[PDB]
């Protein structure tokens, strides 16, 4: 149902780099910039990346975010115990005039 | 910032629903709360933006009304009431403070949520 | 290590068409036009391809350049035994704001 | 356009960097001579550019302030010096005329190069 198409599902072990892609429209990504969000289960969602290239309270430099085209792409390097969290990307739309999100994608912790 | 929202909704299909979120050691004119649905393990999903001043707001492009917007400065709290409710209704309430810029858009801090079943 | 990747060394019979590849991001192929130069073997680097379209005059028309989105192709064509060089795709970056350049790839001319 | 360089120099790491590259064959104070270095394997890698008058120069972002490219009319002249020396900076240093509209714009002509071993 939404407009940024993430994964729904993802899995990684403790200390490898792994990459989420957002993929939407030119009037939303192409024309606007993409927020990474990141929300530990049962607690309120953060932001993690924001302006594809600032972090908005000092938060762990490891994570970085990338944006080509139409598409977006977060990369962590520095899997760790609590990164279990939904993921979800945000961008200002035109056409419908607001903050199209996507569907969010699950980046868990591997035994 | 801290933004506390009301607790767990039960409601009956095709009732109204009424959530507030309040502002706390902040200038709640200008602070302002974009509310954005929520699903358990899914996607967020704005509903809407409003100011406190004059009153203007602006709701999801989808739905040209279903949710109405309200705000008391004096309160510093912002309703939202919810109609014609179905069940893909059932899903969380978060608000959201503005980023910065006098905080009329973008968003920064959630509230604790507001789960309701439909 | 350059930003824009380039395959290592591309052969092919004499006559044949080889086409080399050049990747990346819209910042500076798809916002900037791709450019190709070869460098023979122990010899200055000459200008091969400029803004993908235009040659200037000695070139053959063999060599064609072609860009799509955040890819560029050249197909050098005719293969002859004189072909073998380096062969560097570049173009403006406005995030580093300033010129990049591919990794180069050496073509081969087979027997 | 004959354009003359400087030959192939090994000072060993810590040591200095000399690239001299001479104009010749036309109007010096209106061709300039931007600096390219070819890392092995890496395909061409830009490290800046040179305004014969005034005296304004560019730099790689990558690279610091340590490069240093200046402009010499009267020898019509182009000097390029590296404080850094390590084994990275092993290349070969190609200046070339930067095409036309007063030449300071995009790589045409490269001279025959300097090969540095570090």
């Known amino acids: 149902q939404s407009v940024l198409t993430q994964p729904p599902s993802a899995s990684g072990t403790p200390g490898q780099r792994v990459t989420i892609s957002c993929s939407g429209s030119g009037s939303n990504i192409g024309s606007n910039t993409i927020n990474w969000y990141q929300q530990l289960p049962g607690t309120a969602p953060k932001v993690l990346i924001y302006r594809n290239n600032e972090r908005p309270s000092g938060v762990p430099d490891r994570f970085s975010g990338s944006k080509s085209g139409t598409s977006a792409s977060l990369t962590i390097s520095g899997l760790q115990s609590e990164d279990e969290a939904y993921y979800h990307c945000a961008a200002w739309d035109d056409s419908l005039n607001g903050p199209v999100f996507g569907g969010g994608t699950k980046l868990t912790v591997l035994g | 910032v801290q933004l506390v929202q009301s607790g767990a909704e039960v409601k009956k299909p095709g009732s109204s629903v009424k959530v507030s979120c309040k502002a706390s050691g902040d200038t709640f004119s200008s602070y302002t709360f974009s509310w954005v649905r929520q699903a358990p393990g899914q996607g967020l999903e704005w509903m809407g933006r409003?100011?406190?001043?004059?009153?203007?707001?602006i709701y999801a492009q989808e739905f040209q009304g279903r949710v109405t917007i309200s705000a008391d400065r004096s309160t510093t709290t912002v309703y939202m009431e919810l109609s014609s409710l179905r069940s893909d209704d059932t899903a969380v309430y978060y608000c959201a403070r503005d980023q910065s810029g006098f905080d009329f858009f973008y968003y920064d801090h959630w509230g604790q949520g507001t789960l309701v079943a439909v | 290590q350059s930003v824009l990747t380039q395959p290592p060394s591309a052969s092919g019979t004499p006559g044949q068409r080889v086409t080399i590849s050049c990747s990346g991001s819209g910042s500076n192929i798809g916002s900037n036009t791709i450019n190709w130069y070869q460098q023979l073997p122990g010899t200055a680097p000459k200008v091969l391809i400029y803004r993908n379209n235009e040659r200037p005059s000695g070139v053959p028309d063999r060599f064609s350049g072609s860009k799509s989105g955040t890819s560029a192709s050249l197909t050098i064509s005719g293969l002859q035994s004189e072909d073998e060089a380096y062969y560097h795709c570049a173009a403006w970056d406005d995030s580093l704001n300033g010129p990049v350049f591919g990794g180069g790839t050496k073509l081969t001319v087979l027997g | 356009v004959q354009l003359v360089q400087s030959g192939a120099e090994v000072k060993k790491p810590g040591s200095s960097v000399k690239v001299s590259c001479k104009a010749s064959g036309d109007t010096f104070s209106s061709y300039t001579f931007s600096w390219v270095r070819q890392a092995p394997g890496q395909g061409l890698e830009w490290?800046?550019?040179?305004?014969?008058?005034?005296?304004?120069?560019?730099?790689?972002q990558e690279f610091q302030g340590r490069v240093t490219i200046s402009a010499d009319r009267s020898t019509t002249t182009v000097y390029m010096e590296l404080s850094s020396l390590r084994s990275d900076d092993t290349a070969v240093y190609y200046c070339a005329r930067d095409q036309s509209g007063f030449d300071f714009f995009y790589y045409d002509h490269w001279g025959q190069g300097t090969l540095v071993a570090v």
């Open positions: 409003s100011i406190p001043i004059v009153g203007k707001a």
